[PDB]
Structure formats: C-alpha cells, structure tokens
C-alpha cells in the first residue's frame, strides 16, 4: 500500500481535556517525516496512538492497510514486529548491561548465530560511538549516553517503521552532528521509514521530506521543508522564530488570574 | 444522595477491579505456547520464589513444632498422659497450622517481593519498553511467576510439616524422655492418609492459587508513584492473607466436620 | 530468497542478504571460501547488518585458506553502510 | 588463595554493612529536635504502619487462639481434663506464640512496606532532590518511621493476645460447653503479672527495635535497579525474622528457664 | 569574599576511570557562568562535587570561603540553604501536585503567611508559563512540562547559588525563547549567581559572563563570549562547529578493534 | 532590617523587602493602608518575590478603604521583575 501510516479522523480525551480535534496525517513509505509543535501539545501521544498503547475515539489508524484499534491481542504483537520506538527518557533495562541490551530485540525475532549476534551489535555500538561502553551497567552511564544506547536499540532490528522521540536532545554539537547523519543515512541505504519528533527546527527540517506542525486542536501546516519555509505566513514563522502573540504560543489553558493572585 | 450514590460509586469500582484481575490472568496463562524460552525463565523464578524462602520455613517450622511440644507436655504430664503428645503435635500441623502458617509466611516473603518488583518495574519504564518490542509482558513477566508460585507452596508446606513433626519429636522423645516407641506408635494410628495427608495437600494448592493471583495483580495494577507501591504491598499481605483465613474456615468445615 | 553458487572460480550471490533467510549459507561457509578470488555480488538486492556481518566473516575464511579476495558490483549502499559503521580498510577492501 | 582470600573478601563486606547500618541510625535519631514538624509526620506513619496492620492481627489472632482450643480440647477430654484448657491457650500466647507470631506478621506487612517504599523513593530520585533542598532525608524519612515502628508493635501484641485468649474462650466455654467459672478460675491462678505479663512486654519491645532497624536499612542501602529492590524486600523478611527467632530462644532461656 | 565557588585542584575517580585530572575553576559572585563540553565528560559530576553529594580526592572546594569536604553533617545542611539545584530529569515529588511542589522549599525555610505562600508561587508558575497546571499530579504532566515545573522549584527560594543542569532541553523555540530570558532577568534583577550547564552553544553563550569548555582531563579554554570565540583556535572551533578530528571529540575510550568484530 | 513609618500622608518604606524579615509589616497591614495616597519606596534596597507579593496586597487594602494609590522612586528592578512575572496594569500601576 502506497503510504505506511494513515490517520483518518482521530480524536482523543484525557478525561476532560480535548486534544486532537480532527487530525488526519499520512506517512509515506520510506521517507523521513517530521512532527513538530509547541510543548504539551500531544506529540508523544501521537506516537503512542500508532503503536496501539492507547486507543482513539473517532478514527482508524491504518498501519499498512489494516486498522490498529480493530486488532486483537494476539494479532497486535504480530504486527508490532514491524515498528520499533525510541522512548523520551532512555528507558532501558537496568538489570542488563549495554551489549546485552542492544542485542535484546534481535535475540527474539532473528535466529542469528552466536558470532553473528556479536558482530552485528558491535557495529550498532559504533554507529552512535558507544563502543567500549559494552560492559557498563545502565546505572553508570551518564544520561546523554543513555540515549545513544537506547538509540542503538531502536535500530537494532532494522524494522519497517522507527518512531524516534526527541533523539537529538542532551547532545553536544559534534555528537548530534553525527546522530543527524545516522538517521539521514538509514533511510537512504536501507529504506527504513522513520518518524522524527523533535524541537530542533534547523536539524530535522534539513533531513525530513514531509514535515508537520501541530497547533491547538489540529494541524496548522505541512509540506516539504522548502515549501514549508515562510510560505505559510500567519501562524508558522511565529513558531519557527519569534516571542510575541499568535494563536496560543505557550502558557497551558490557565484559569482566571487575579482570583489566583489575590486570595 | 451522598450515602446512597457514593456507596454505589465505590462498589462499582470494585466490580472493575475483579474484572481487571480476571482479564489479566486469562491473557497470561491462555496463550500460544513456548517450551524452550519459558522453561529457562521458570528455573529463575522457582529459585527466587521458592529457594530463598526455604530458610524461613525450616527455621520457623521447628519453632512452632517445639512450642506445641513444650506447652503440650506441661499440661498433659499431671495426668501421666505424655505418651499422647504426638497426637497433638502431628494433628495441629497436618490439619490447620501447616497449610495456614506456611501460607502467611509465603504471602509475606514471596507475596510482597512479587508485588514490589512488578510495581517498580512498571514505574522505571521497563514494562512500556518491553511491550513496545513485540514482547508480551503478561507472557514474559506474569506467566513464569504464576506457575512458579503454584508449585513452590505445596512443596514448602511438606517441609514445614516434616520439621514441625520432628520439632515436636525433639522435645518429646529426646529432651523430656518420653519413650521412643510409645510416642511414634500413638501418632501412627491417628493419622489417616485420606483425612490428614491428602486433605493437607488440597488445602495448600487452593492457598497457592489464591496468594499468587493477588500478589501479581496488586503489582500490575498499581499506581507507579512513591506511596502507590507501598500501599499495593500492604494491599497484598492483607487481602491475600485474609483469603487464606477466610477460605480455611470454609474448607475445614467441609473436610473435617 | 537467498540463492547462491560459485561460477567455478568466483563466488556469485543472488537475492537479498537479510536476517530472515541467512542460515543456508552460514552452514556452508567451509566449501565456499577456499579457492575463490572475488565475490561477485552482482544481483543481490540489498544488504542488511545481518548480511554485512556475514560478509566480514565470509571474506575472512577466504583470506586465509585461499586467494586474497576482492569485491565487485556494489550499489554504493554497502559503502554508505560501511562508512556509517566506521569499517576500516582491513575488514572491507573498499 | 581462593578459599582463603575470598572468604576474607566476603566477610569484610559484612563488616561494612554493620557499620553502614549503625551510622545510619546515629544520624537519624541523635539530632537537633523539632516537635511541631515531626509530630504531624508521626501521625501519618503511625497510621500507615499500625492501623492498616490492625485487621491482619485481629483476624489471625482469633484463629490461632481457636486451634489451640480445638486441638487442645480433643486431646484433653479423654482424661476429663477440659477445665484446664485455659492454662494451655493463655500460656502458649502470653509466653511464646504472642511475641513471635505477631512479630513475623509485622515483619511481613510493615517490614516489606517500609523497605519497598524507601527503596523506590531512592530510585525515583525523591531522595536526591530532598537532600539537595537542605532537608535531611534521615531526619524526615527514617526518623518518624523508626519511632512509629517501635510504638506500633508492643500495642499490636496485646491485641493479638487479648483476642487469642478470647478466641480460646469461644470454643472452650461457648462451643464445647466447659463451665464458665472453672475455665476462667483455672486461668487466673496460673498467670502471674511478673513472669507472664511483663515478660511478654519486654519481648515485644526487643522485637520492635530489631524488626524496624532491619526494615529501614535494607530500604536505604538498596541497589535502585529492578531486582535490587525485590531482593532487598526478600532480605528484609528473612533477616529480620531470623533475628526474631534467634533472639526468642535466648530470651526464653533467660526469662522462663 | 570576592568569588563564590573556588576549586583549588580537584581530582576524581569512578573506581578505575580518571576524570578531572587537575581542574581549577572559579565562579564570580552574581554573574552567569556557563559550563560546556563533550558528552560523558563529567559536567553533572562537576555540579555534584559542589553540593557535597560526592567527595573529591585532591582539592578544596571553597563555597564562599569555607571548604565543602571538611564540613560535618550538621553544618553541611546549614550551608545548603544557600544553593538550590535543577536536576537533569525533572525529579519532582510524585505524590504531590505542582502547586504543593513549587511551594515546598519555601514552606521549610521561610515563615511566610498562608496568603503570601499562595501569591508567591502563583507568580513562579507564571514565569515559566505553567499556571493553570497547579492541580495536576506529576504523572499527568508531559515531560517537557515536568522541567518547567522543576525549574520553578529551583528558583522558588531565590537562594544565593542556582546550579542549572540542562534547563533548555525538550522545549519548543517559543518557550526556550522565554526560559532564556528568565535566567537573564534573574541575575540582572535579584543578583542571583547562576551556573548554567548546557549543550546549546548559541543560547547560553549569549547570556553568560565567563564560559568554560571541558576536554579530556581538564579545562581547555575559558573567556567571555567574544574572548572565548574565534580566540582559542585548535581545539575550540572544532567543538563549537565541525565533525572531524581534534583531541577526542566523542567515542568513549574504547578497546581494540577487529577482536571486537571478529570472534 | 525592614523599617517603616508613614510621613503623615505617604507610606514611606526603608530597608529590604526580603523573605527573612517581613512579618512586622504583615501584621500591621490594617492601620497603614487607610488614608494613604502614595507609597514612597524611596530608600528600600531591593524587592524579592516575598516582598513583591506583599506589595500587591498592601496596595489592594489601600485601594478600597482609601485614596487610589500611586508609586514613587523605583530602581527599574521592580519593573523588570514585573514584566518577568507578567503583572498587568491592574495589580501594579506601572
Ligand atoms: N497520564 C498522563 N500521562 C501523560 N500525559 C497526560 C496524562 N494525562 C493527561 N496528559 C496530557 O497529555 C498531554 C501529552 O502531551 P505530550 O506528553 O506528547 O507533550 P509533548 O509533545 O511530549 O511536550 P514536550 O515535548 O514539551 O514534553 C500533556 O499535555 C498532558 O497534560
Ligand atoms: N554510578 C555512576 N553514575 C553516573 N555516572 C557514572 C557512574 N559511574 C561512573 N560514571 C561515569 O561518570 C561520568 C559522569 O559524567 P556526566 O554524567 O556528568 O556526563 P554529562 O556531562 O552529563 O554528559 P551528558 O550531558 O551527555 O549526559 C560518565 O561518563 C559515567 O561514565
């Protein structure tokens, strides 16, 4: 099918709040697609709807032709061999060192031999640069090193879809100088569909093929980088640069005010 | 309103809790089998649940067999009836004090250690990254912990009994000088294989399914905050060891009445 | 479907070097390294890391009990996957 | 080498563990006082440790008082000696089964809940952000949890006894028809205030200092990983309830021998 | 005394590794001082030595004239009323909502009244913009909102020293457009000495008065934004921009090759 | 040391409006708001948030049972601490 992830008309509700009014986005097969927006808008909630960890209210999420919430428990973990995910906080197995942590998702789904499961993941720890840290337990890594170890675990299997979730944060500009080249040389060399969610507007716009900017309830703009650079005038070019007013830049939907200050 | 609706609010929330616990076990046990990836994992959890708990049952098995030999002797020796001490030690244990006290010591050690582990695993994001790797957490974490708990309890009962009977045979025969032949011969034709030995085996299996189910559920549906895990651990020891003492009265009215 | 057979003096390959189907060639890594001068690599679609880690072993068994091996017919997809993983000129002869 | 040095390696590491636990308590109790910021915090931990554990002691107190009334009656009624049943129920509890079984049920519920809480508090970074706010964690977290544990155990013993004595007075006087006057009058002049009542109070305080110290130390010096907290909870129930059964033999040889 | 934090000759050892050979830095009183360097170099370890949570091996750490490792337990928590710290991961009290979380360090050390402890922290949740989120527990904040709630708790007391630790990460460029102005308008209006540790070389260099760049064992360069820009030629201007070789850009001190790849 | 007394028709302040010493003036917020036309603020060194949150209350008690109040003698340190906290022109009259 012509594009991998299709969202028809998705809605969501965290008890009382109304995020995702009537969003509808598509992800093509084999191209890096960015996702941006203000803080607390539901970008990580957008990635968790695709994986099936939470369910929408009003739409279908078509992963390669089949619906995600209309899928049973035994079929969901068969489809989930196709999509990996980097988490926001590292979130790696603390009772298991780095070499046994990168080698974990391809010890489950690949029947690779023992000196081939040792040569594959000794290359995955050279892409991010974290080789020689193959014996430290993940309580003596730093915290910017615990993302580069959880970035190798997102690309260890080479699945059909990778859903990154802020990979570039907490990195010096000689390490996110090569972590941006690793994602740009994975879909160029293996054909892996990536989904990059980040807050570095010069970094991921230089590599994505179809970006997306989110606003209050739904999509505000979306097109190739160049075609999404200043051509949407009123609400974009305030988010990409600027401090002053537009439609709701930040400041979570607060209540009155004075009543807050004065007793 | 308030006395009428809020007891309807807070009783319906228990009907979801019984449904959340039933749906957890059906998705954990009833599954597509794997006999060479769960079998190395069963040996780990049979070690963690059972073997580390074997020291607390051996040491506390000898003690409660001794005090039924000490306080059983002193109240019986005025009537010159100390040759019927074995009928008191080996019938308190084989009927009631065996399946129950070895259940409360199991819900303490193994019951809290399973709930404080799967609770903290859920809070340190190791159950979200495991299920986002096409690895079922109810088949990897819950399933070899249920089968290693339904096995470790009926074997830990017969170690609690067989040192409790021997513990009463240390202050009876050896320390207080009751005869070596009249002691054991009065115990032998008072213990039947159907009423006292199989009905202790049936009691331990029912307590093993009960304790292990409540211990895994309170450590799965727990709030991952600071006091969320500390009051799911308290919720394990109280609820799963009231269902021991609640089911024991029902069973002892059926198998011995 | 990984299909392979040498041409008599050159180990030709075909298919894809995936991680799904690789064990037919990992077992037969003994009779297909000796007496070979070049890996043809002509009509293999794509190479993954579960097919590139084999190639650093399939060259090594052919370097020691045979002719020093050379390569042929790449897509510049096993080269951008070689400078990415920082492989020196020892393990892969460019 | 290996048999000689590695037993010297692994025994010295225990000498640091005894020193780490002593230095923890001296810095927790011996401190600059505060009587209107720790006293609202003591009421919370007196509720968490004690009051939630009061249901498990009441229900399990009646049961172990009943089975010493059931199995105590059937072995005594052949000699027509059922009017000395109270000397068996109210002396098993006041001497040994009171301070010990109410200690093992305390180290289970309260002993694990304190170790699984301060362990997870240490792993979710709530002890690093508290000490970086000029707030002592050994005076805020450990100190009202030690005093609320040395208080809740000697009060939970006398609730375990007074329903165990009443539990044996339900199957003695009411259910099996022993006389209401000969039962209590045979119990009264066999229980002395110095040998049976104060020597149960002394037993409970020593078990309260012992259980609470090991429960807080294993939840403070724990590895904050996944199985680090699950084997510090197991380390609490085993070590702190072997020091119950180890100190009980020493004390019962001194106060009753 | 003329400068707040002085390090004479500090050394450190994580069991076997040797970080901090012979570093010696100073922090002036009332000026924002930056700290930069590659990943896994020990910047968070540099902040934890000042607080006294770990101890050095070879030096004195002079906080306002007195030594930190030569300080007893009852005197250390008297001096620690002067320094707060933002943590890397948020690290806020999960059993306590945001309004009772910002109001926590000034419910301990200030005897403020009840409608003044409610008007002070209702302003602290307006500086970062997180007002109206004063009732959510910190398990339903996002993760970029859980730093803006832990940023208000670092400035709630207004202590003499604030040790930020990556405050700008995981924020859109209209929110870190005002979080950079909050730190620049705190030492300009209250005289608070800040210590900023970050990996955003255009952001914090625009506000700091004396930056610091760390290298393999010790300091490599220091100087105001301009004095520290273009000035130091060989090893600086490779870290600030560039991909290729200098002295050890990244790739943790790995062992031998081949033998890792080949069995 | 927060020292204060009105000049008869203008509430003058002195010292610093810290969080260490503030309760001498929070208790006496009743006799020092009525009949005042302007807060002098002349020789106060600095104002913290535990001294600026009082000023939004000390103005409010003087606005309702007295003359509408005005301000005097700022350092542009209680103004850059006012646009930082986004205080409108109601609570602070610039
Ligand atoms: N239990 C919950 N867990 C997480 N988020 C919740 C929960 N309940 C409600 N929410 C809301 O859902 C939204 C989730 O948004 P999300 O976490 O994706 O923000 P984000 O895009 O990651 O922002 P940032 O990148 O700044 O962290 C938040 O605004 C939060 O307020
Ligand atoms: N128990 C431990 N906890 C944390 N770090 C440890 C521990 N033991 C050793 N280390 C080492 O100490 C160093 C600490 O450095 P630090 O965490 O400050 O890096 P960093 O500057 O925060 O890098 P980044 O910003 O990329 O996370 C790490 O390189 C780590 O390898």
Author numbering:
A (entry chain B), E (entry chain E): 5 to 267
B (entry chain A), D (entry chain D): 3 to 259
C (entry chain C), F (entry chain F): 4 to 97
Give sentences copied directly from the paper behind this entry:
MlaFEDB is assembled in a stoichiometry of 2:2:6:2 (MlaF:MlaE:MlaD:MlaB). MlaD forms a hexameric disc-shaped ring on top of MlaE, with a central pore lined by hydrophobic residues and has been shown to contain phospholipids.
For cryo-EM studies, the purified MlaFEDB complex with the E170Q mutation (MlaFEQEDB) was incubated with 2 mM ATP-Mg2+ prior to the preparation of cryo-EM specimen. Image processing generated cryo-EM maps of the MlaFEQEDB complex in different conformations (EQtall and EQclose) at resolutions of 4.3 and 3.7 Å, respectively. EQclose structure demonstrates tight closure of ATP-binding sites with the Walker A and signature motifs in close proximity, with a clear ATP-like density in between, which is consistent with an ATP-bound conformation. The structure of EQclose showed tight dimerization of the two MlaF subunits, caused by the trapping of ATP-Mg2+ at the ATP-binding sites. The two TMDs move toward each other. TM1, TM2 and TM5 bend clockwise, when viewed from the front side, to collapse the central phospholipid-binding cavity, and accordingly no bound phospholipids were observed in the collapsed central cavity. The TMD conformational change further induce the movement of MlaD. EQclose structure elucidates that the ATP binding-coupled conformational change further collapses the central phospholipid-binding cavity and squeezes out the bound phospholipids.
